[PDB]
Amino acid sequence: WQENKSWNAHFTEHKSQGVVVLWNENKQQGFTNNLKRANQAFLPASTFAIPNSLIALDLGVVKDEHQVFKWDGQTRDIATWNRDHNLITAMKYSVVPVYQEFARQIGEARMSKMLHAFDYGNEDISGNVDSFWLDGGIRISATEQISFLRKLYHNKLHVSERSQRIVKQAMLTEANGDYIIRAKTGYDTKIGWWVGWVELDDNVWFFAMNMDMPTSDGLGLRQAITKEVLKQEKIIP
Amino acid sequence: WQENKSWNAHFTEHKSQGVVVLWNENKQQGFTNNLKRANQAFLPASTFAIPNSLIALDLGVVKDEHQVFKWDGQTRDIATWNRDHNLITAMKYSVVPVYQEFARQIGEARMSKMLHAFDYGNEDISGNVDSFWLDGGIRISATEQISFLRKLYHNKLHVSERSQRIVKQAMLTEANGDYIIRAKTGYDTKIGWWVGWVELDDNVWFFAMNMDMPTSDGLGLRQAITKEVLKQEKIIP
Ligand SMILES: *C(=O)[C@H]([C@@H](C)O)[C@H]1CC(SCCNC=N)=C(C(=O)O)N1
Ligand SMILES: *C(=O)[C@H]([C@@H](C)O)[C@H]1CC(SCCNC=N)=C(C(=O)O)N1
Numbered sequence: 001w002q003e004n005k006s007w008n009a010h011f012t013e014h015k016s017q018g019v020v021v022l023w024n025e026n027k028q029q030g031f032t033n034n035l036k037r038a039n040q041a042f043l044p045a046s047t048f049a050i051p052n053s054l055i056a057l058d059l060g061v062v063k064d065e066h067q068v069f070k071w072d073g074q075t076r077d078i079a080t081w082n083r084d085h086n087l088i089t090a091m092k093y094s095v096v097p098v099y100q101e102f103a104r105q106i107g108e109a110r111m112s113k114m115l116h117a118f119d120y121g122n123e124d125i126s127g128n129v130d131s132f133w134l135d136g137g138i139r140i141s142a143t144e145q146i147s148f149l150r151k152l153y154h155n156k157l158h159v160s161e162r163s164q165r166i167v168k169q170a171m172l173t174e175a176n177g178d179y180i181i182r183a184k185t186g187y188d189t190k191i192g193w194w195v196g197w198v199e200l201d202d203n204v205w206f207f208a209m210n211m212d213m214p215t216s217d218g219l220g221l222r223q224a225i226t227k228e229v230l231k232q233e234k235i236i237p
Numbered sequence: 238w239q240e241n242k243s244w245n246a247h248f249t250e251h252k253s254q255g256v257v258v259l260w261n262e263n264k265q266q267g268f269t270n271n272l273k274r275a276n277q278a279f280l281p282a283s284t285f286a287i288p289n290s291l292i293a294l295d296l297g298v299v300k301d302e303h304q305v306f307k308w309d310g311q312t313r314d315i316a317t318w319n320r321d322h323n324l325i326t327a328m329k330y331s332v333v334p335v336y337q338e339f340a341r342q343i344g345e346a347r348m349s350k351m352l353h354a355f356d357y358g359n360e361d362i363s364g365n366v367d368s369f370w371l372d373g374g375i376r377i378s379a380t381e382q383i384s385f386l387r388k389l390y391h392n393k394l395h396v397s398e399r400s401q402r403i404v405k406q407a408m409l410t411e412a413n414g415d416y417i418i419r420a421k422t423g424y425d426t427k428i429g430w431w432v433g434w435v436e437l438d439d440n441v442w443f444f445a446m447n448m449d450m451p452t453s454d455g456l457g458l459r460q461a462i463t464k465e466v467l468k469q470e471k472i473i474p
């Protein structure tokens with residue numbers, strides 16, 4: 001691990017504070033603007049959709065990425081949530097009601113055992129099974145996110161290879177002639193997350209970032225700040 | 238099937254001739270500028286990488302999308318070919334030596350049976366096992382390409398679901414907040430191919446196009462012409 005304090009300019013020039021963590025897979029080396037905050041644990045918020053979807057698929061709660069989850073008919077504030085979804089669109093739109101339904105069907109016992117087998121964060125599901133990742137006791141740091149993501153990339157998590165490929169499919173966010181990004185956003189009204197990886201021809205760069213997000217105004221800064229670091233480091237054009 | 242002769246403006250305004258075929262999955266309806274050429278069979282050229290990779294994976298010739306195929310040490314004219322590749326980069330760079338090696342390991346007997354089970358084109362492997370898709374007798378039309386692609390999308394081809402997901406992963410070409418394109422290019426010095434599909438939130442549009450390509454000058458017109466039709470039809474922004 002290597003601290004590059006010069007990356008802080010990417011946060012400060014947007015009047016922002018936070019951390020970006022990168023991991024070069026081929027070289028087994030990591031880089032961050034702030035080593036301390038890189039190991040500070042936070043609520044995972046919607047980034048928990050990754051472990052949640054893996055367990056749901058492995059347990060048969062979800063059949064595949066095109067199976068339809070019917071909207072329960074309760075209208076919620078996020079307009080995109082009030083409709084039928086599959087795994088692809090549930091991830092893209094961070095559709096909490098779908099993931100709460102996943103968690104209820106999984107149950108507390110299977111959830112806790114599976115998170116332990118994943119070595120995910122602090123492994124604490126207290127106390128609502130359908131809302132612990134939002135307002136309970138589970139916490140994960142940026143470096144622990146990368147640790148979890150590396151296992152998923154290599155199909156080394158303690159679930160079926162098929163479950164892992166399907167979740168990696170659903171993580172697809174961006175792709176062009178130079179790179180592929182699979183990732184997941186999160187927001188809990190206090191902090192904002194962006195965790196994933198960048199696939200290249202001959203390497204992969206894992207990333208985890210979070211930042212203070214007092215208001216929804218600048219949620220877009222999560223992706224923008226990350227891409228500016230990737231550009232600076234010549235990872236993407 | 239419905240012929241929209243107005244799409245020909247997309248070819249003629251580039252001094253080009255060819256066909257674009259689209260298929261609306263949700264509505265089960267197809268559209269093309271030229272119904273005749275839509276059913277005209279051509280050499281598949283590098284688009285054969287899709288069936289070839291499926292059979293190789295199902296037979297164990299390829300383990301997964303990150304397994305390394307060592308370059309044989311013969312330098313060929315395409316600079317990108319003279320190096321180690323995996324399934325991802327073999328598809329992106331259309332690396333013929335890798336696919337010829339696949340075909341040799343598969344063999345004529347298994348190749349012919351598998352193409353028949355796929356109902357792929359005319360199902361004629363004459364006569365070089367490692368070069369028939371380039372200069373042999375196999376031929377496929379644009380509508381037959383879509384027929385093959387629909388089965389792959391639904392995991393309905395006569396191979397493992399795992400093999401089909403891995404090939405669909407390797408077909409990834411482009412992705413943003415509005416759509417995902419999985420596809421494969423082809424070029425045989427006479428005609429140029431672009432076959433695949435566009436994934437949306439709630440639908441999929443399959444496509445197959447080919448055009449006369451006398452010189453390498455305008456290979457980029459394959460993607461450009463296709464995207465202009467998609468834009469005209471309000472499939473992508
Ligand atoms: C997850 O972190 C949250 C949810 C649990 O509060 C969802 C909600 C949002 S913002 C809603 C509007 N979307 C704007 N893009 C996100 C998010 O990551 O943006 N995740
Ligand atoms: C497949 O159709 C051919 C090969 C069998 O001749 C390959 C070669 C090319 S062009 C080589 C340089 N690349 C430019 N982009 C393609 C192609 O589809 O572009 N496929």
Ligand SMILES: [Cl-]
Nearest residue numbers: 168169405406
């Ligand atoms: Cl994918």
Ligand SMILES: [Zn+2]
Nearest residue numbers: 117157158159
């Ligand atoms: Zn076990």
Ligand SMILES: [Zn+2]
Nearest residue numbers: 354394395396
């Ligand atoms: Zn059979």
